[PDB]
Design a protein around this ligand. Structure first.
Ligand SMILES: Nc1ncnc2c1ncn2[C@@H]1O[C@H](COP(=O)(O)OP(=O)(O)O)[C@@H](O)[C@H]1O
Ligand SMILES: Nc1ncnc2c1ncn2[C@@H]1O[C@H](COP(=O)(O)OP(=O)(O)O)[C@@H](O)[C@H]1O
Ligand SMILES: [Mg+2]
Ligand SMILES: [Mg+2]
Ligand SMILES: [Zn+2]
Lengths: 621, 651, 49, 42, 267, 49
DNA sequence: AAAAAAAAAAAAAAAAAAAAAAAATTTTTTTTTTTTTTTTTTTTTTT
DNA sequence: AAAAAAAAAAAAAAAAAAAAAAATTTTTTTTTTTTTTTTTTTTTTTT
């Protein structure tokens, strides 16, 4: 056993006398400055890094990792005790709960009588007067665990897991301390809520009412109470860590306070928290014993590995004029050839600028459909784009169909209500939806995709659901074969319809075979003049481009009009082109300008857009 | 305090006998070695063979079988004492060492139907299929509380009164001190035990036809909770007992029964094979002495009962050995699984080859064209109906992950199902999703399909494209496509008939006396041990009626299984010479001018053709135990693909 | 409680709990039987037991 | 989370013909505190 | 199993202090010599001078004299530990060792007339004249039973709840096995302790002349049973406690107070 | 026992035993007051209280 | 190959069979202690 | 020194207060299981 007063002193010592050179090499009191901030009420969440703690006290780290809840409370109490001596001015009462705390403290001081001893229950609860919250950051030496392996043997421990977020409730107020006011005396009563349910009190235990022996019925109310942002999410194992034949395992994660609104369904996250049980009374327990649920209380949520939330080297790399080609060649380096296809995919990943001229939106998303023979790496390209893009949903033929693409309605648990859960399109709302086997996809699904392309929304008027969803995603379809199957339905919608025909050819086939065989030899593409960018770098560059909206100067108006009219004449003479093609020109040029990271598009961007468009068009022939 | 036994003669005798049995040092230390192995592996459950227990002391065996709880407690005490004697620190680390049972249960081996109330408080080994499972919940076995007001630290213990009389006193969780001081539980210090409840249903192929199935509820605890998932053909050895009802005042006399599992086992076919020193030495000897023709020997010894089809047999061996997956740093994946499609004339033993693969290859799932329809074939998304949450059900492909799916009547299979499995055939994964859930299940299975050509029988005078109604998109992902023709050559008919008649005239030595009918009727199966979860091996099959004679032996089935299991783990690396040879051969193959006239391609040539070339070379390397893909391996791969991809159009 | 009290406080009002271990249980099945179709009068729903 | 149970805390009675028993107890307390015997001279 | 105590700060401190007080080699050695003496004489009670305890540790003296029960429990645990340290073979013979007190008790030295409610749970020293001296009855503390049917032997343990709340389950004497087999109690193996009750009256010369006498009931456990007889003048030191009544849905505030003598000495 | 919420299985009826050592006791005495002999009327009995 | 019809499934709503939960002071008995009365025994006074 | 009267001692019977002892199943809820139904969706057939 351990003396928790000594432990509190240890954590106080650490929190006060820990320093680091984080701030531009200058030595800083990492936690002292944060304590000052949240004593001024400028910060709410205090993330104690257990690596920092272990830097000088490994045993404290082990004790925390073994009984995290106890030491979580110890750290919170130490912070609360230290705040007054770190406060350096009066807070501006930014919150009504701050007003309540001010009034409570002032009245306690007014009726202090310092020498008198008040009963243990005649005092404000700790949680009622915190206005802050202390979380951990798991020590790096703790290997992340598998949701399947997180079992009863590690209840109350601090563990970190990684997985895909499947279901996430909304943020709703969870009572933490229920405040009641009496109708006789005029005191207050505080019930700290710990169980999932509580029975509201009826009789006021205040001293005045106890002396009067009066009724003292008290009224529960939300004004003086203490709520906390609450959320409940389902976190799913990663495909690579599931056993041979099993299905991925889920875990329930309860998120509170400032950890809320971090993760959203579809995100790849790492969550560090304490594995805690919930008592399971109420049911007709078949087997005797105190059985309980299990959940992870979220202390640190970190989006990772697909949607993580500069340097002179990268600035120079951007300044390079061949940065466009560098990124293109970096898109799926293993895939040999398909240079223009990969450039189009990069333009897809970047996207054009959204327009809102006088009450109608011309979305900047780029829609690409890869028609091709078997074995031309369309599936590989779509899978790579899924792994690369931040919000990417890769939907095959019919496994994710109907409500697998559109939202449905499911009963809730926190509220028992009917909540609207998004499908693949909504999960990729503002990213990339890689549709595979688009030709073989169902008719209702195809119509939904057409509607999302034309409007970025999904209207539903079925029985249990009646809503107008929002899915501002870019469609990357991969169909197979007017050649032999070239629907005008696809032509009229897809901004870039690419045909990938692989005619046999000794030289090209031999080069591709050498590429493939080296790939199988060394688990990597053959070395080239330019090393391909790592996915993190590609995502960073693309994201920086995304917020670089370039405009179209009026000088290029006549050039664009001439190119469009020339293409119209060529199409009319030959054996499809329209305003959709013109808008494809505009948004491809805008995306090229954005890639170059300028504010104004140029004739070079327009020419490249036209070149890619003509390559796609003559791929048909 | 309370009553404390001093001289329990039966308990003392049971402990003495169990410790004597577990000593085993003079009895070739079988259980001594098992205890040492579990100590090293950091396990606290000893699995004891009831047959060995009965051989040592039939009295103890009968007492244990007929009195489960008492004898199991005595056995666990003896095991804990033995573990302390061998190593005290480990014994102190683990509070209770459990004992599960295994072996041949004469009468106690039953099914959920035959499991009647006559087996209460006995050890029963019940077979079945897990119809459902429950979430693994922790039950507190020792709670720790801290009182801030007094700084005291108390610890309450709860006994395992699952099938014993329980009172409110034992199951009250302290929430105040004797002076009404609120407590706070130390979750980290507290001791929890994982607990799960599953349902075992009688196997449909074993249940009486046309009747509803019989189920039983099973309780799993620490170290057995996640030993099974829905759809698992499991053998649960446990204690059958009546679950206490809630404190009443009026009782109807009805008692829910349950099986407290002491051991859970899956199908032993998928279990890790036992490789003894002599077995591994024999494998080494085989691989080293014979490497040049080892692949051919294995291919010809694969299915003795099916004559001919040498190339198809070699392709099936390559499929069994598999290739090697490529896990690129950027996440791109390349499957190492060979897909084979046998199409051709009726009565060419294609279904027999598929059945042989089903019987031999581990994790082999049978399937029929219309037997599985979409959601049944791939994974499916349903709802719990009690929680309102989505749930995933594994399909045939998912269950066959890291295995084989043997599909028959592939042509009869609806186009929708083939389109659905397209992804599995190449990416080896199932991508399903509904509104409340989305997953990407792993289905890394090789597809071995059989089909009948359009018009029922193959048309020698029509293109293979027209004979096979499968379009190029589906044909390409099939690594090999073999057309098995029922040629009417008199000499081939002679050979086939001779082989068939010899196989028919064979009788098993010893078991068959010349007139026996081996079929049993629904009783002997339970009477004798199941040959599906059961526990010296030669190398070359002794000469028998299967073949007449020659200077070439046939590989034993068990030896071949062990050799294939060992060789599948090998990941031979592609050499530069083989890489160049394969690249040039792929270029030539794709260039149509290489192949002669009057020759039509069975399936189109593609990057996937190159990939299957590489995979076949890798499989040949695995067969050779080479660890490097060599020129001979590349030659065999190119030979096989060249034979498979072209068929001469007769006229 | 039957126990011959020795002058202590008497056992509680409803002190008895079933000991599932110390019980003799037997199989028991519930069947539904229907009036034979021929035995049913012409216009009459079959009886059940 | 449903295992522990904290007490019920409460604060002081800030704010706010028969006289309440608390009022009479306060008057008794003031009588004990502020009953003066003697004289300015003594 | 039930709610055992993992660590107890106050109990650990008390036992450490008492063991330190009892271990006297750097000091004069009085109490080490006394423990050796009782070991030689084959006894299981040590007389500890409250004056010496107050001299070496004021806090322990105040705690022992104001909350005697648990303090005496800790002192006796320390005594048994010390006796085991000196010689474990003898410490194993006796289940427990007892701590009687002597010396000077400032305000805890009272007469039966002055032994009021204020001294409940405290250690008190009362000098008086014995009036009543009941018989020495054996009280069973550990009963051994034998089942002829199953050949089993059982031991039932009864806690000394003279002044603590007692529930019937504690005092249920077993007569039938689990399956209602007859149980025979083995008297030769069971454990009994001598118990006696006496009454101490205010000394006639010291009592006020006008008024009637005042008396106090004294419980003497083993080793203190036949130390006094009626008419003798004796000093009894022990804990003044309240005796529980019997189970009942109604109760008057009245409680029956007694004195559990920890030592008795002749006038 | 009002504290039955800590566990579904219920405590008996009339379950409470008084714990002696946790009682705050005080001295109490009974006296027999008799009317004043000079207050008792001439032919009467002394009243008591 | 596309449209219409059929059915097949999934999920949600609803109604019993069995099990589980809730609610529960008052009357009478006996033991102890204390007092009153009878007779025997002992003590004290008178002859 | 003995007898007669007085008083005390011992012993037994009766009464009052206070602590102890004895007696004490029915009714309602509600959860689970089963079935029913409405709509969506999927498959099959036909032109
Ligand atoms: N251009 C290419 N470069 C590298 N590998 C390729 C190329 N085309 C096809 N492949 C390989 O062939 C296999 C089939 O490709 P896939 O993505 O299924 O094509 P499709 O999208 O036409 O189905 C994959 O394993 C892939 O690695
Ligand atoms: N080459 C062969 N050697 C031995 N038996 C054969 C051969 N070809 C066909 N058969 C026999 O034909 C029977 C049925 O063949 P089957 O597996 O149904 O082929 P299919 O699936 O084409 O109908 C089997 O029992 C098998 O023994
Ligand atoms: Mg594809
Ligand atoms: Mg067949
Ligand atoms: Zn009030």
């Amino acid at each position: 056993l351990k003396d928790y007063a000594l432990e509190k002193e240890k954590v106080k010592k650490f929190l006060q006398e820990f320093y680091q050179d984080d701030e531009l090499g200058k030595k800083q009191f990492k936690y002292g400055n944060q304590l000052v901030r949240l004593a001024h009420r400028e910060q709410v969440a205090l993330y104690v890094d257990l690596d920092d703690v272990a830097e000088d006290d490994p045993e404290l780290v082990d004790s925390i990792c073994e009984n995290a809840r106890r030491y979580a409370k110890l750290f919170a109490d130490a912070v609360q005790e230290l705040l007054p001596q770190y406060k350096e001015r009066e807070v501006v009462n930014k919150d009504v709960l701050d007003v309540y705390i001010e009034h409570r403290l002032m009245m306690e001081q007014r009726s202090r009588d310092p020498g008198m001893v008040r009963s243990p229950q005649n005092q404000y609860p700790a949680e009622l007067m915190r206005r802050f919250e202390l979380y951990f950051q798991g020590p790096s030496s703790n290997k992340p665990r598998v949701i399947r392996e997180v079992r009863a043997d590690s209840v109350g421990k601090l563990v970190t897991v990684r997985g895909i977020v499947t279901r996430v409730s909304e943020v709703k107020p969870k009572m933490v301390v229920a405040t009641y006011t009496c109708d006789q005396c005029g005191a207050e009563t505080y019930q700290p809520i710990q169980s999932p349910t509580f029975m509201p009190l009826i009789m006021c235990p205040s001293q005045e009412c106890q002396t009067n022996r009066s009724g003292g019925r008290l009224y529960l109310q939300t004004r003086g109470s203490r709520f906390i942002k609450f959320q409940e999410m389902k976190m799913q194992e990663h495909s690579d860590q599931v056993p041979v034949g099993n299905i991925p395992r889920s875990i329930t994660v309860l998120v509170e306070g400032e950890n809320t609104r971090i993760a959203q369904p579809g995100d790849h996250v790492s969550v560090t928290g304490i594995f805690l049980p919930i008592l399971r009374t109420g049911f007709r327990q078949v087997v005797q014993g105190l059985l309980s649920e299990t959940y992870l209380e979220a202390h640190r949520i970190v989006k990772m590995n697909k949607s993580e939330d500069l340097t002179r080297e990268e600035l120079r790399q951007i300044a390079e004029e061949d940065f466009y080609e560098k990124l293109a060649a970096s898109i799926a380096p293993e895939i040999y050839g398909h240079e223009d296809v990969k450039k189009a995919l990069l333009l897809l990943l970047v996207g054009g600028v959204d327009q809102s001229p006088r009450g109608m939106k011309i979305r900047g998303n780029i829609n690409i459909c890869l028609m091709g023979d078997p074995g031309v790496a369309k599936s590989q390209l779509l899978s790579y784009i899924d792994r690369l893009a931040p919000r990417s949903q890769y939907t095959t033929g019919r496994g994710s169909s109907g409500v697998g693409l559109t939202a449905a309605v499911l009963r809730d648990s926190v509220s028992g209500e009917l909540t609207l859960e998004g499908g693949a399109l909504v999960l990729a709302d503002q990213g990339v939806c890689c549709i595979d086997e688009f030709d073989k996809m169902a008719e209702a699904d195809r119509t939904a995709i057409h509607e999302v392309m034309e409007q970025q929304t999904i209207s539903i008027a079925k029985a249990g659901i009646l809503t107008t969803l929002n899915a501002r995603c870019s469609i990357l379809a991969a169909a197979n074969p007017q050649n032999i199957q070239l629907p005008a339905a696809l032509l009229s919608r897809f901004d870039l319809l690419w045909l990938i025909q692989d005619r046999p050819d000794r030289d090209n086939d031999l080069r591709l075979a050498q590429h493939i065989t080296y790939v199988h030899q060394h688990s990597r593409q053959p070395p080239s003049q330019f090393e391909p960018l790592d996915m993190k770098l590609m995502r960073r560059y693309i994201a920086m481009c995304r917020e670089k909206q370039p405009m179209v100067p009026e000088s290029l108006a006549d050039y664009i009009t001439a190119a469009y009219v020339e293409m119209r004449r060529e199409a009319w003479a030959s054996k499809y082109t329209s305003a959709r093609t013109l808008l494809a020109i505009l948004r491809l040029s805008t995306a090229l300008a954005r890639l170059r990271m300028v504010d104004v598009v140029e004739k070079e961007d327009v020419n490249e857009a036209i070149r890619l468009m003509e390559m796609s068009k003559d791929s048909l022939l | 305090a309370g009553t404390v036994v001093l001289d329990d003669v039966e308990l003392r005798e049971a402990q003495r006998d169990y410790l004597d049995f577990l000593d085993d040092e003079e009895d070739q230390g079988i259980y001594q070695s098992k205890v040492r192995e579990l100590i090293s592996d950091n396990q606290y459950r000893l699995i004891v063979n009831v047959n060995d227990l009965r051989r040592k002391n039939e009295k103890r065996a009968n007492r244990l079988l007929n009195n489960a709880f008492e004898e199991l407690v005595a056995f666990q005490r003896a095991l804990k004492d033995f573990v302390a004697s061998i190593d005290a620190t480990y014994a102190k680390q683990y509070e209770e060492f459990y004992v599960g049972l295994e072996g041949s249960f004469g009468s106690k081996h039953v099914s959920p139907r035959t499991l009647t109330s006559c087996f209460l408080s006995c050890v029963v080994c019940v077979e079945g299929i897990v119809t459902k499972c429950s979430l693994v919940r922790p039950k507190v076995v020792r709670s720790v509380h801290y009182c801030p007001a007094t700084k005291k630290t108390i610890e309450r213990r709860y006994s395992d009164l699952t099938t014993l009389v329980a009172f409110p006193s034992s199951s009250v969780y302290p929430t105040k001190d004797e002076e009404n001081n609120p407590l706070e539980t130390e979750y980290g210090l507290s001791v929890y035990k994982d607990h799960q409840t599953i349902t075992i249903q009688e196997m449909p192929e074993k249940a009486p036809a046309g009747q509803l199935p019989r189920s039983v509820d099973v309780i799993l605890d620490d170290d057995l909770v996640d030993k099974a998932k829905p759809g698992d053909r499991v053998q649960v050895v446990g204690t059958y007992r009546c679950l206490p009802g809630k404190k009443g005042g009026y009782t109807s006399g009805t008692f829910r029964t349950v099986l407290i599992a002491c051991n859970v086992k899956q199908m032993s076919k998928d279990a890790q094979p036992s490789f003894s020193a002599e077995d591994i030495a024999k494998i080494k000897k085989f691989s080293k002495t014979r490497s040049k023709d080892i692949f051919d020997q294995l291919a010809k010894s694969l299915a003795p009962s099916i004559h001919g089809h040498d190339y198809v047999k070699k392709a099936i061996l390559c499929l069994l050995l598999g290739g090697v997956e490529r896990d690129l740093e950027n996440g791109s994946h390349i499957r190492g699984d060979i897909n084979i499609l046998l199409i051709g004339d009726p009565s060419v033993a294609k279904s027999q080859l598929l059945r042989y693969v089903l019987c031999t290859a581990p994790r082999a799932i049978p399937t029929t064209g219309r037997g599985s329809s979409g959601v049944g074939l791939t994974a499916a998304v349903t709802t719990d109906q009690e929680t309102g949450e989505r749930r995933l059900e594994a399909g045939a492909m998912v269950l066959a992950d890291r295995g084989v799916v043997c599909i028959d009547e592939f042509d009869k299979m609806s186009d929708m199902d083939r389109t659905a499995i397209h992804e599995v055939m190449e990416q080896g994964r199932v991508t399903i999703a509904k509104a409340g859930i989305h997953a990407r299940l792993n289905a890394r299975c090789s597809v071995l399909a059989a089909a009948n050509p359009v018009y029922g029988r193959y048309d020698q005078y029509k293109t293979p494209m027209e004979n096979i109604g499968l379009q190029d998109s589906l044909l390409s992902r099939f690594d090999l496509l073999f057309i098995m023709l029922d040629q009417m050559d008199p000499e081939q008919d002679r050979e086939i008939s001779d082989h068939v008649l010899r196989m028919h005239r064979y009788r098993a030595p010893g078991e068959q006396d010349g007139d026996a009918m081996p079929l049993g009727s629904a009783v002997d199966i339970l009477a004798t041990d199941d040959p599906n979860f059961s526990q010296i091996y030669e190398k070359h099959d002794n000469l028998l009626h299967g073949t007449k004679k020659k200077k070439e032996k046939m590989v034993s089935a068990a030896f071949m299984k062990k050799y294939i299991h060992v060789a599948k783990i090998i990941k031979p690396v592609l050499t530069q010479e083989s890489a160049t040879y394969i690249a040039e051969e792929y270029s030539r193959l794709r260039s149509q001018d290489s192949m002669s006239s009057d020759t039509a391609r069975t399936s189109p040539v593609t990057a996937r053709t190159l990939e299957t070339l590489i995979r076949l070379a890798t499989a040949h390397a695995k067969a050779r135990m080479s660890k490097t893909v060599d020129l001979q391996d590349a030659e065999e791969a190119v030979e096989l693909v060249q034979y498979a991809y072209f068929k001469k159009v007769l006229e | 409680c039957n126990t011959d009290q020795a002058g202590r406080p008497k056992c509680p009002l409803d002190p008895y709990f079933i000991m599932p271990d110390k019980c003799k249980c037997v199989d028991f099945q519930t069947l539904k039987l229907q009036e034979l179709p021929d035995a049913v009068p012409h216009g009459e729903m079959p009886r059940h037991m | 989370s449903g295992f522990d149970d904290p007490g019920i805390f409460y604060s002081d009675s800030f704010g706010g013909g028969q006289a309440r028993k608390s009022q009479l107890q306060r008057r008794f307390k003031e009588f004990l505190r502020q009953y003066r015997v003697g004289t300015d001279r003594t």
